[PDB]
């Protein structure tokens, strides 16, 4: 058996074809086993509607999860990714840096 804790990155993107649509993204990568719980938070509260994911495996069986959805950030709001995984004894929270 192998267990590997995920690397978590939180960032924002506009599709190059549409600068009017902003997306908040969590990329949760390199993890084993694949069981996981991933949420986006807005001011500490779970965002229930997250419209997209891309889920994949590498040759060594590591998992790669992209979890993302449209949003409209304002300067008062703090966003974050919260992850639970077998490797984490408490939920891991990674805050979004609004420059990213």
Alpha-carbon distances of 47 from 38, 93, 97, rounded to whole Å? 11, 14, 17
CA-angle at 53, arms to 58 and 19, nearest 5° = 115
Number of domains making up the chain: 1
With b for 16 or more beta-carbon neighbours within 10 A and e for fewer, the 39-78 pattern comes to: bbbeeeeeeeebeeeeeeeeeeebbbbbbbeebeeeeeee
| Experimental technique for the deposited model | X-ray
Number of residues assigned to the chain: 100
HEC sequence for 77-99: CCEEEEEECCCCCCCEEEECCCC
* CATH number of the domain enclosing 8: 2.60.40.10
Q: How far out from the chain centre does Cα 58 lie?
A: 18
C-alpha torsion angle, residues 41, 21, 17, 82 (rounded to 10):
0
Q: What is the domain range of residue 10?
A: 1-100
CA 89/CA 96 separation, integer angstroms: 22
């Amino acid at each position: 058996m192998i267990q590997r804790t995920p690397k978590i990155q939180v960032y924002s993107r506009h599709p190059a074809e549409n600068g009017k649509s902003n997306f908040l993204n969590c990329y949760v990568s390199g993890f084993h086993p694949s069981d996981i719980e991933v949420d986006l938070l807005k001011n500490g509260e779970r965002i229930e509607k997250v419209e997209h994911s891309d889920l994949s495996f590498s040759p060594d069986g590591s998992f790669y999860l992209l979890y993302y959805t449209e949003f409209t950030p304002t300067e008062k709001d703090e966003y974050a990714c919260r992850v639970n995984h077998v490797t984490l004894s408490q939920p891991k929270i990674v805050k979004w840096d609004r420059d990213m």
